[PDB]
Amino acid sequence: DTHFPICIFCCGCCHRSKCGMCCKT
């Protein structure tokens, strides 16, 4: 597994429907 928070890419996160990179904060 992986620790958190963590910064990675995702399609529909931190206000990014398309696909952006953000941290779990």
Q: Quick check: 24 and 5 in contact, CB under 8 A?
A: yes
Q: Which residue(s) pair with 7 in the sheet?
A: 23
Taking the C-alpha atoms of residue 13 and residue 8, their distance in angstroms, rounded to an integer, is 10
Q: Quick check: 21 and 6 in contact, CB under 8 A?
A: no
Residue with tokens 């990014």: 16
Residue 14: how many other CB atoms lie within 10 Å: 11
How was this structure obtained? NMR
Taking the C-alpha atoms of residue 25 and residue 8, their distance in angstroms, rounded to an integer, is 11
**Backbone dihedral angles phi then psi of residue 17, each to the nearest 5 degrees:** -50, -55
Domain ranges, residue 9: 1-25
Total number of domains in the chain:
1
The encoded tokens of residue 22 equal: 């953000």
Taking the C-alpha atoms of residue 19 and residue 11, their distance in angstroms, rounded to an integer, is 4
The encoded tokens of residue 19 equal: 């696909």
Q: Quick check: 5 and 13 in contact, CB under 8 A?
A: no
Taking the C-alpha atoms of residue 25 and residue 18, their distance in angstroms, rounded to an integer, is 20
